[PDB]
Amino acid sequence: MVSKGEELFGGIVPILVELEGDVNGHKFSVSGEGEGDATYGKLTLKFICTTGKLPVPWPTLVTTLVQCFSRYPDHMKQHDFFKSVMPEGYVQERTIFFKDDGNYKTRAEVKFEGDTLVNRIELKGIDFKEDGNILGHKLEYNYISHNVYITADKQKNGIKANFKARHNITDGSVQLADHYQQNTPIGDGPVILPDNHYLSTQSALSKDPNEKRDHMVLLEFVTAAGI
């Protein structure tokens, strides 16, 4: 049995991302486009800040800005919550705690609109230091790579995740971003609660040399593991 959910990701899927943000009263909007190929765990996206200069560093937004594109090994396909709820989708909520600084709280809906997988996000950041690493733009524009630890959340018919992102600071130090995540189904269909496992996640950040807007180009690979 391959499910409707799984079948929607058998080929290359167009992706749209729309984010509305407010961090310490700094409002901004981001739009993203590209495509995902779940067979290889592969995302290719370009994001634009449509309101001018982004007021936080681009690497702090990467995790917020579609885990339905992760590659689940065949022997782990019954543990893929993300595709099991498609096309109706899931709500994804996080709190992201920046060590010795503020926090993001995010709420997103991830679902199909026609053939296109959409991620609509609102982000609220509070308690940031004005000349801290985030509002002061002291984070390097590089890669990001860690494991995303997933566990079932039977009680809410969905899942939880936790992970630590460690952002390099321009002085050589590290800015920890401690993530707490919950995902729940939008619709009322079958409940696929996974065994404990993780997503091995990597992303390469780059710039389009022809682009004059504040922007980020992202190449991402994610593979499920641990079982």
Side-chain angles (χ1 to χ4, degrees):
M1 290 291 310
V2 304
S3 49
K4 189 173 303 206
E6 286 178 316
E7 165 174 7
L8 288 177
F9 295 88
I12 303 177
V13 176
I15 302 167
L16 303 169
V17 184
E18 294 285 314
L19 177 145
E20 289 307 329
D22 176 326
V23 174
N24 271 53
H26 302 271
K27 297 173 45 183
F28 60 104
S29 303
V30 170
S31 297
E33 310 189 356
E35 61 187 38
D37 192 355
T39 301
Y40 307 98
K42 178 176 186 179
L43 297 184
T44 51
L45 298 159
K46 177 175 169 187
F47 302 90
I48 304 292
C49 177
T50 61
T51 51
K53 178 180 187 35
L54 196 72
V56 298
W58 282 105
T60 73
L61 304 180
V62 161
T63 59
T64 300
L65 295 165
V66 290
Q67 291 176 314
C68 49
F69 290 100
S70 299
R71 183 182 71 81
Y72 278 72
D74 179 76
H75 77 274
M76 297 175 59
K77 280 207 205 295
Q78 75 276 27
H79 299 295
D80 185 352
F81 164 88
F82 308 101
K83 292 180 187 66
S84 73
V85 299
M86 297 298 169
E88 301 83 0
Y90 52 85
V91 173
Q92 181 160 297
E93 294 169 288
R94 295 210 179 100
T95 303
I96 302 170
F97 297 93
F98 296 89
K99 185 174 173 59
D100 301 310
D101 212 334
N103 63 87
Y104 301 163
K105 284 190 184 78
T106 67
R107 189 178 182 282
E109 288 196 27
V110 185
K111 70 188 172 165
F112 283 80
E113 293 291 359
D115 287 346
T116 302
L117 185 284
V118 178
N119 183 197
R120 288 171 178 100
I121 311 148
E122 300 172 11
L123 182 150
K124 182 72 167 285
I126 70 176
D127 292 327
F128 286 90
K129 292 167 186 179
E130 308 323 318
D131 204 40
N133 295 330
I134 290 88
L135 289 174
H137 297 285
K138 318 184 180 178
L139 302 180
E140 301 277 20
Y141 189 76
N142 38 55
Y143 298 67
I144 307 184
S145 174
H146 53 250
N147 292 337
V148 173
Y149 298 94
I150 298 173
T151 61
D153 196 354
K154 195 178 93 85
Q155 306 78 12
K156 221 163 284 105
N157 292 146
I159 58 172
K160 289 183 147 44
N162 66 86
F163 50 108
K164 296 184 191 296
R166 297 164 197 286
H167 299 295
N168 294 332
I169 302 169
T170 57
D171 73 355
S173 191
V174 50
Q175 173 64 68
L176 175 63
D178 199 8
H179 292 59
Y180 296 82
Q181 177 180 336
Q182 293 159 22
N183 298 72
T184 55
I186 290 171
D188 203 42
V191 185
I192 278 73
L193 301 158
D195 293 353
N196 290 6
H197 62 284
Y198 69 89
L199 308 178
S200 169
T201 306
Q202 71 186 98
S203 69
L205 289 54
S206 65
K207 301 293 186 177
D208 175 357
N210 299 316
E211 184 55 71
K212 297 144 177 225
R213 295 169 293 179
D214 197 2
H215 77 285
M216 173 175 65
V217 177
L218 194 53
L219 174 62
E220 189 170 313
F221 292 95
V222 183
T223 307
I227 292 181

Coordinates of all heavy atoms in Angstrom, one line a residue, residues 82-155:
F82 N 4.4 13.3 7.8 CA 4.3 14.5 7.0 C 3.6 14.3 5.8 O 2.7 15.0 5.4 CB 5.7 15.1 6.8 CG 6.5 15.3 8.0 CD1 7.6 14.5 8.4 CD2 6.3 16.5 8.8 CE1 8.4 14.7 9.4 CE2 7.1 16.7 9.9 CZ 8.1 15.8 10.2
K83 N 3.9 13.2 5.0 CA 3.2 12.9 3.8 C 1.8 12.2 4.1 O 0.9 12.4 3.3 CB 4.0 11.9 3.0 CG 5.3 12.5 2.4 CD 6.1 11.6 1.5 CE 7.4 12.1 1.1 NZ 8.3 12.3 2.3
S84 N 1.7 11.5 5.2 CA 0.4 10.8 5.6 C -0.8 11.7 5.7 O -1.9 11.2 5.4 CB 0.5 10.0 6.8 OG 0.5 10.8 8.0
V85 N -0.6 12.9 6.0 CA -1.7 13.9 6.1 C -2.1 14.7 4.9 O -3.0 15.6 4.8 CB -1.5 14.8 7.4 CG1 -1.5 14.0 8.7 CG2 -0.3 15.7 7.1
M86 N -1.3 14.5 3.8 CA -1.5 15.2 2.5 C -2.6 14.6 1.7 O -2.8 13.4 1.7 CB -0.2 15.3 1.8 CG 0.9 16.1 2.5 SD 0.4 17.8 2.7 CE 1.7 18.3 3.8
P87 N -3.4 15.4 1.0 CA -3.1 16.9 0.6 C -3.6 17.9 1.6 O -3.3 19.1 1.5 CB -3.8 17.1 -0.7 CG -4.9 16.1 -0.6 CD -4.4 14.9 0.0
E88 N -4.5 17.5 2.5 CA -5.1 18.4 3.5 C -4.1 19.1 4.4 O -4.3 20.2 4.8 CB -6.2 17.7 4.3 CG -7.3 17.1 3.4 CD -7.0 15.7 2.8 OE1 -5.9 14.9 3.0 OE2 -7.9 15.3 2.0
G89 N -3.1 18.4 4.8 CA -1.9 19.1 5.4 C -1.8 18.9 6.9 O -2.5 18.3 7.6
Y90 N -0.9 19.7 7.5 CA -0.6 19.8 8.9 C -0.3 21.3 9.3 O 0.1 22.1 8.5 CB 0.6 19.0 9.3 CG 1.9 19.1 8.6 CD1 2.8 20.1 8.9 CD2 2.2 18.3 7.5 CE1 4.0 20.2 8.2 CE2 3.4 18.4 6.9 CZ 4.3 19.4 7.3 OH 5.5 19.5 6.6
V91 N -0.6 21.5 10.6 CA -0.2 22.8 11.3 C 1.2 22.4 11.9 O 1.4 21.4 12.5 CB -1.1 23.2 12.3 CG1 -0.6 24.4 13.2 CG2 -2.5 23.6 11.7
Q92 N 2.2 23.3 11.7 CA 3.5 23.2 12.4 C 3.7 24.4 13.3 O 3.7 25.5 12.8 CB 4.6 23.1 11.3 CG 6.0 23.0 12.0 CD 7.0 22.5 10.9 OE1 6.9 21.3 10.4 NE2 8.0 23.3 10.5
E93 N 4.0 24.1 14.5 CA 4.2 25.2 15.5 C 5.6 25.0 16.2 O 6.0 23.9 16.3 CB 3.2 25.2 16.6 CG 1.8 25.7 16.0 CD 0.7 25.5 17.0 OE1 0.3 24.3 17.3 OE2 0.2 26.6 17.5
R94 N 6.3 26.1 16.4 CA 7.6 25.9 17.1 C 7.8 27.1 18.1 O 7.2 28.2 17.8 CB 8.8 26.0 16.1 CG 9.0 24.9 15.1 CD 10.4 24.6 14.8 NE 10.6 23.5 13.9 CZ 10.8 23.7 12.6 NH1 10.6 24.9 12.0 NH2 11.0 22.7 11.9
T95 N 8.5 26.8 19.1 CA 9.2 27.9 19.8 C 10.7 27.6 19.6 O 11.2 26.5 19.7 CB 8.9 27.9 21.3 OG1 7.5 28.0 21.5 CG2 9.6 29.1 22.1
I96 N 11.5 28.7 19.2 CA 12.9 28.7 19.0 C 13.6 29.6 20.0 O 13.3 30.9 20.0 CB 13.2 29.1 17.6 CG1 12.5 28.2 16.6 CG2 14.7 29.0 17.4 CD1 12.7 28.7 15.2
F97 N 14.3 29.1 20.9 CA 15.0 29.9 22.0 C 16.4 30.1 21.6 O 17.2 29.3 21.5 CB 14.9 29.1 23.3 CG 13.6 28.9 23.9 CD1 12.9 27.6 23.5 CD2 12.9 29.8 24.6 CE1 11.7 27.3 24.1 CE2 11.6 29.4 25.2 CZ 11.1 28.2 24.9
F98 N 16.7 31.4 21.4 CA 18.1 31.8 21.1 C 18.8 32.0 22.4 O 18.4 32.9 23.2 CB 18.2 33.1 20.2 CG 17.6 32.8 18.8 CD1 16.3 33.0 18.5 CD2 18.5 32.4 17.8 CE1 15.8 32.7 17.3 CE2 18.0 32.1 16.5 CZ 16.6 32.3 16.3
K99 N 19.8 31.2 22.7 CA 20.5 31.3 24.0 C 21.0 32.7 24.3 O 21.7 33.3 23.4 CB 21.6 30.3 24.0 CG 22.3 30.2 25.4 CD 23.3 29.1 25.3 CE 24.2 28.9 26.5 NZ 23.4 28.7 27.7
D100 N 20.7 33.2 25.4 CA 21.1 34.6 25.8 C 20.5 35.7 24.9 O 21.1 36.8 24.8 CB 22.6 34.7 25.9 CG 23.2 33.7 27.0 OD1 22.7 33.7 28.1 OD2 24.2 32.9 26.7
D101 N 19.4 35.4 24.3 CA 18.7 36.3 23.5 C 17.2 36.0 23.5 O 16.8 35.3 24.4 CB 19.4 36.4 22.1 CG 19.3 37.8 21.5 OD1 18.4 38.6 21.8 OD2 20.1 38.1 20.6
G102 N 16.5 36.5 22.5 CA 15.1 36.3 22.4 C 14.6 34.9 21.9 O 15.4 34.0 21.8
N103 N 13.3 34.9 21.6 CA 12.7 33.7 21.0 C 11.8 34.1 19.9 O 11.2 35.1 19.8 CB 12.0 32.9 22.1 CG 10.8 33.6 22.7 OD1 9.6 33.6 22.2 ND2 11.1 34.4 23.8
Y104 N 11.7 33.1 18.9 CA 10.7 33.1 17.9 C 9.6 32.1 18.3 O 9.9 31.0 18.8 CB 11.2 32.7 16.5 CG 12.3 33.5 15.8 CD1 13.0 32.9 14.8 CD2 12.6 34.8 16.2 CE1 14.0 33.6 14.1 CE2 13.6 35.5 15.5 CZ 14.2 34.9 14.5 OH 15.2 35.7 13.8
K105 N 8.4 32.5 18.0 CA 7.3 31.5 18.0 C 6.7 31.6 16.6 O 6.4 32.6 16.1 CB 6.2 32.0 19.1 CG 6.7 31.6 20.4 CD 5.7 31.7 21.6 CE 6.5 31.4 22.9 NZ 7.3 32.5 23.5
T106 N 6.5 30.4 16.0 CA 6.0 30.3 14.7 C 4.8 29.4 14.6 O 4.6 28.4 15.3 CB 7.1 29.8 13.8 OG1 7.4 28.4 14.1 CG2 8.3 30.6 13.9
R107 N 3.9 29.8 13.7 CA 2.7 28.9 13.3 C 2.6 28.9 11.8 O 2.6 29.9 11.2 CB 1.4 29.4 13.9 CG 0.2 28.5 13.8 CD -1.1 29.0 14.5 NE -2.2 28.0 14.3 CZ -2.9 27.8 13.3 NH1 -2.7 28.4 12.1 NH2 -3.9 26.9 13.3
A108 N 2.5 27.7 11.2 CA 2.4 27.5 9.8 C 1.4 26.5 9.4 O 1.2 25.6 10.2 CB 3.8 27.0 9.3
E109 N 0.9 26.6 8.3 CA 0.1 25.6 7.6 C 0.7 25.1 6.4 O 1.1 26.0 5.6 CB -1.4 26.2 7.4 CG -2.1 26.4 8.7 CD -3.7 26.6 8.6 OE1 -4.3 26.2 7.6 OE2 -4.2 27.2 9.5
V110 N 0.9 23.8 6.2 CA 1.5 23.2 5.1 C 0.6 22.3 4.4 O 0.0 21.4 5.1 CB 2.8 22.4 5.5 CG1 3.5 21.9 4.4 CG2 3.7 23.3 6.4
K111 N 0.2 22.6 3.2 CA -0.8 21.8 2.4 C -0.7 22.0 1.0 O 0.0 22.9 0.5 CB -2.2 22.2 2.9 CG -2.6 23.6 2.4 CD -4.0 24.0 3.0 CE -4.4 25.4 2.8 NZ -5.8 25.5 3.2
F112 N -1.3 21.2 0.2 CA -1.4 21.4 -1.2 C -2.5 22.5 -1.6 O -3.6 22.4 -1.1 CB -1.6 20.1 -2.1 CG -0.4 19.3 -2.2 CD1 0.0 18.5 -1.2 CD2 0.4 19.4 -3.3 CE1 1.1 17.6 -1.4 CE2 1.5 18.6 -3.5 CZ 1.9 17.7 -2.5
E113 N -2.1 23.3 -2.6 CA -3.0 24.2 -3.4 C -2.8 23.7 -4.8 O -1.9 24.2 -5.5 CB -2.6 25.6 -3.2 CG -2.9 26.2 -1.8 CD -4.3 26.3 -1.3 OE1 -5.3 26.0 -2.0 OE2 -4.4 26.8 -0.2
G114 N -3.7 22.8 -5.2 CA -3.5 22.2 -6.5 C -2.3 21.3 -6.5 O -2.2 20.5 -5.5
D115 N -1.5 21.5 -7.4 CA -0.2 20.6 -7.6 C 0.9 21.2 -6.7 O 2.0 20.7 -6.8 CB 0.4 20.8 -9.1 CG -0.5 20.1 -10.2 OD1 -1.3 19.3 -9.8 OD2 -0.2 20.4 -11.4
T116 N 0.7 22.3 -6.1 CA 1.8 23.1 -5.4 C 1.7 22.9 -3.9 O 0.7 23.0 -3.3 CB 1.7 24.6 -5.8 OG1 1.8 24.7 -7.3 CG2 2.8 25.4 -5.1
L117 N 2.8 22.6 -3.3 CA 2.9 22.5 -1.9 C 3.2 23.9 -1.3 O 4.2 24.5 -1.7 CB 3.9 21.5 -1.5 CG 4.1 21.1 -0.1 CD1 4.9 22.1 0.8 CD2 2.9 20.6 0.6
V118 N 2.4 24.3 -0.4 CA 2.4 25.7 0.2 C 2.7 25.6 1.6 O 2.1 24.9 2.3 CB 1.1 26.4 -0.2 CG1 1.1 27.8 0.4 CG2 0.9 26.5 -1.7
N119 N 3.6 26.5 2.1 CA 3.9 26.7 3.5 C 3.6 28.2 3.9 O 4.3 29.1 3.3 CB 5.4 26.4 3.7 CG 5.9 26.6 5.1 OD1 7.2 26.6 5.4 ND2 5.0 26.6 6.0
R120 N 2.5 28.4 4.6 CA 2.1 29.8 5.0 C 2.4 29.9 6.4 O 1.9 29.1 7.3 CB 0.6 30.0 4.8 CG 0.2 30.1 3.3 CD -1.3 30.1 3.4 NE -2.1 30.2 2.2 CZ -2.6 29.3 1.4 NH1 -2.5 27.9 1.7 NH2 -3.3 29.7 0.3
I121 N 3.2 30.9 6.9 CA 3.8 31.0 8.2 C 3.6 32.4 8.8 O 3.8 33.4 8.0 CB 5.4 30.9 8.1 CG1 5.8 29.7 7.2 CG2 6.0 30.8 9.4 CD1 7.1 29.9 6.5
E122 N 3.3 32.5 10.0 CA 3.5 33.7 10.8 C 4.5 33.4 11.9 O 4.5 32.4 12.5 CB 2.2 34.1 11.4 CG 1.0 34.4 10.5 CD -0.3 34.6 11.3 OE1 -0.3 34.8 12.5 OE2 -1.4 34.7 10.6
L123 N 5.4 34.4 12.1 CA 6.5 34.4 13.0 C 6.4 35.6 13.9 O 6.3 36.7 13.4 CB 7.8 34.4 12.2 CG 9.1 34.3 13.1 CD1 10.2 33.6 12.3 CD2 9.6 35.7 13.5
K124 N 6.6 35.4 15.2 CA 6.6 36.5 16.2 C 7.8 36.3 17.1 O 8.1 35.2 17.7 CB 5.4 36.4 17.1 CG 5.3 37.5 18.1 CD 4.9 38.8 17.5 CE 4.5 39.8 18.6 NZ 3.1 39.4 19.0
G125 N 8.7 37.3 17.1 CA 9.9 37.3 17.9 C 9.8 38.4 18.9 O 9.5 39.5 18.6
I126 N 10.2 38.0 20.1 CA 10.2 38.9 21.3 C 11.4 38.7 22.1 O 12.1 37.7 22.1 CB 8.9 38.8 22.1 CG1 8.9 37.5 22.9 CG2 7.6 39.1 21.4 CD1 7.7 37.3 23.9
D127 N 11.7 39.8 22.9 CA 12.8 39.7 23.9 C 14.2 39.7 23.3 O 15.2 39.3 24.0 CB 12.5 38.7 25.0 CG 11.3 39.1 25.9 OD1 11.1 40.3 26.1 OD2 10.6 38.2 26.3
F128 N 14.4 40.1 22.1 CA 15.7 40.2 21.5 C 16.5 41.5 22.0 O 15.9 42.5 22.3 CB 15.6 40.2 20.0 CG 15.3 38.8 19.5 CD1 14.0 38.4 19.3 CD2 16.3 37.8 19.3 CE1 13.7 37.1 18.9 CE2 16.0 36.6 18.9 CZ 14.7 36.2 18.7
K129 N 17.8 41.3 22.1 CA 18.7 42.4 22.3 C 18.9 43.2 21.1 O 19.2 42.7 20.0 CB 20.0 41.8 22.9 CG 19.8 41.2 24.3 CD 20.9 40.4 24.7 CE 20.6 39.7 26.0 NZ 21.8 38.8 26.4
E130 N 18.8 44.5 21.2 CA 19.0 45.4 20.1 C 20.3 45.3 19.3 O 20.3 45.4 18.1 CB 19.0 46.9 20.5 CG 17.9 47.4 21.4 CD 16.6 46.9 20.9 OE1 16.4 46.8 19.7 OE2 15.8 46.5 21.8
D131 N 21.4 45.1 20.1 CA 22.7 44.9 19.5 C 23.2 43.5 19.8 O 24.4 43.3 19.9 CB 23.7 46.0 19.8 CG 24.8 46.1 18.7 OD1 24.6 46.0 17.4 OD2 26.0 46.3 19.1
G132 N 22.3 42.5 19.9 CA 22.7 41.1 20.1 C 23.0 40.5 18.7 O 23.1 41.2 17.7
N133 N 23.2 39.3 18.7 CA 23.7 38.5 17.5 C 22.6 38.5 16.4 O 22.9 38.3 15.2 CB 24.1 37.1 17.8 CG 25.3 37.1 18.7 OD1 26.2 38.0 18.6 ND2 25.4 36.1 19.5
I134 N 21.3 38.6 16.8 CA 20.2 38.5 15.9 C 19.9 39.9 15.3 O 20.2 40.1 14.1 CB 19.1 37.8 16.5 CG1 19.4 36.3 16.6 CG2 17.9 37.8 15.5 CD1 20.0 36.0 17.9
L135 N 19.5 40.8 16.1 CA 19.1 42.1 15.6 C 20.4 42.9 15.1 O 20.3 43.8 14.3 CB 18.3 42.9 16.6 CG 16.9 42.4 16.8 CD1 16.2 43.1 17.9 CD2 16.1 42.3 15.5
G136 N 21.5 42.5 15.7 CA 22.8 43.2 15.3 C 23.4 42.5 14.1 O 24.5 42.9 13.6
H137 N 22.8 41.5 13.5 CA 23.4 40.8 12.3 C 24.9 40.3 12.5 O 25.8 40.7 11.7 CB 23.3 41.7 11.1 CG 21.9 42.0 10.6 ND1 21.1 41.1 10.0 CD2 21.1 43.1 10.9 CE1 19.9 41.6 9.7 NE2 19.8 42.8 10.3
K138 N 25.1 39.5 13.5 CA 26.4 39.0 13.8 C 26.6 37.5 13.5 O 27.4 36.8 14.0 CB 26.8 39.4 15.2 CG 26.5 40.7 15.7 CD 27.0 41.0 17.1 CE 26.6 42.5 17.4 NZ 27.0 42.8 18.8
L139 N 25.7 36.9 12.7 CA 25.7 35.6 12.3 C 26.3 35.4 10.9 O 26.0 36.1 10.0 CB 24.3 34.9 12.4 CG 23.7 34.9 13.8 CD1 22.3 34.2 13.8 CD2 24.6 34.4 14.9
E140 N 27.2 34.4 10.7 CA 27.7 34.1 9.4 C 26.6 33.5 8.6 O 25.7 32.8 9.0 CB 28.8 33.0 9.6 CG 30.0 33.5 10.4 CD 31.0 34.3 9.7 OE1 30.7 34.9 8.7 OE2 32.1 34.4 10.3
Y141 N 26.8 33.6 7.2 CA 25.9 33.1 6.2 C 26.5 31.8 5.7 O 27.2 31.7 4.8 CB 25.8 34.2 5.1 CG 24.7 33.9 4.1 CD1 23.4 34.2 4.4 CD2 25.1 33.5 2.8 CE1 22.4 34.0 3.4 CE2 24.1 33.2 1.9 CZ 22.7 33.5 2.2 OH 21.8 33.4 1.3
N142 N 26.2 30.9 6.6 CA 26.5 29.5 6.3 C 25.6 28.6 6.8 O 24.7 28.9 7.7 CB 27.9 29.1 6.6 CG 28.4 29.7 7.9 OD1 27.8 29.5 9.0 ND2 29.5 30.4 7.9
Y143 N 26.0 27.4 6.3 CA 25.4 26.1 6.1 C 24.7 25.9 7.4 O 24.9 26.7 8.4 CB 26.4 25.0 6.1 CG 27.5 24.9 5.0 CD1 28.5 25.8 4.9 CD2 27.5 23.8 4.2 CE1 29.5 25.7 4.0 CE2 28.5 23.6 3.2 CZ 29.5 24.5 3.1 OH 30.5 24.3 2.2
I144 N 24.0 24.9 7.4 CA 23.3 24.4 8.6 C 23.2 23.0 8.5 O 22.8 22.5 7.5 CB 22.0 25.1 8.7 CG1 22.2 26.6 8.5 CG2 21.2 24.7 10.0 CD1 20.9 27.3 8.7
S145 N 23.5 22.2 9.6 CA 23.4 20.8 9.6 C 23.4 20.2 11.0 O 24.2 20.3 11.9 CB 24.6 20.1 8.9 OG 24.6 18.7 9.0
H146 N 22.3 19.4 11.2 CA 22.0 18.7 12.5 C 20.9 17.7 12.3 O 20.3 17.6 11.2 CB 21.6 19.8 13.5 CG 20.5 20.7 13.1 ND1 20.7 22.0 12.8 CD2 19.2 20.4 13.0 CE1 19.6 22.5 12.4 NE2 18.6 21.6 12.6
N147 N 20.6 17.0 13.3 CA 19.5 16.0 13.4 C 18.3 16.6 14.0 O 18.4 17.3 15.0 CB 20.0 14.8 14.1 CG 21.0 14.0 13.4 OD1 21.2 14.0 12.2 ND2 21.7 13.2 14.2
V148 N 17.1 16.3 13.4 CA 15.8 16.7 14.0 C 15.2 15.4 14.6 O 14.9 14.5 13.9 CB 14.9 17.2 12.9 CG1 13.5 17.4 13.4 CG2 15.5 18.4 12.3
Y149 N 15.1 15.4 15.9 CA 14.6 14.2 16.6 C 13.1 14.2 16.8 O 12.5 15.1 17.3 CB 15.3 14.1 18.0 CG 16.8 13.9 17.9 CD1 17.6 14.9 17.9 CD2 17.2 12.7 17.6 CE1 19.0 14.8 17.7 CE2 18.6 12.5 17.3 CZ 19.5 13.6 17.5 OH 20.9 13.4 17.2
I150 N 12.4 13.2 16.2 CA 11.0 13.1 16.1 C 10.4 12.1 17.1 O 11.0 11.0 17.1 CB 10.5 12.8 14.7 CG1 10.9 14.0 13.8 CG2 9.0 12.5 14.6 CD1 10.7 13.8 12.4
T151 N 9.3 12.4 17.7 CA 8.6 11.4 18.6 C 7.1 11.6 18.4 O 6.6 12.6 18.0 CB 8.9 11.6 20.1 OG1 8.5 12.9 20.5 CG2 10.4 11.4 20.4
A152 N 6.4 10.5 18.6 CA 5.0 10.6 18.4 C 4.3 11.4 19.5 O 4.8 11.4 20.6 CB 4.3 9.2 18.4
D153 N 3.2 12.0 19.2 CA 2.4 12.7 20.2 C 1.0 12.2 20.0 O 0.1 12.8 19.4 CB 2.4 14.2 19.9 CG 1.8 15.0 21.1 OD1 1.3 14.3 22.1 OD2 1.9 16.2 21.1
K154 N 0.8 10.9 20.5 CA -0.5 10.2 20.4 C -1.6 11.0 20.8 O -2.7 11.1 20.1 CB -0.4 9.0 21.4 CG -1.4 7.9 21.3 CD -1.2 6.8 22.3 CE -2.0 7.0 23.6 NZ -3.4 6.4 23.4
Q155 N -1.5 11.8 21.9 CA -2.5 12.6 22.5 C -3.1 13.6 21.6 O -4.3 13.9 21.6 CB -2.1 13.1 23.8 CG -1.6 12.1 24.8 CD -0.1 11.5 24.5 OE1 0.6 12.1 23.8 NE2 0.2 10.4 25.2

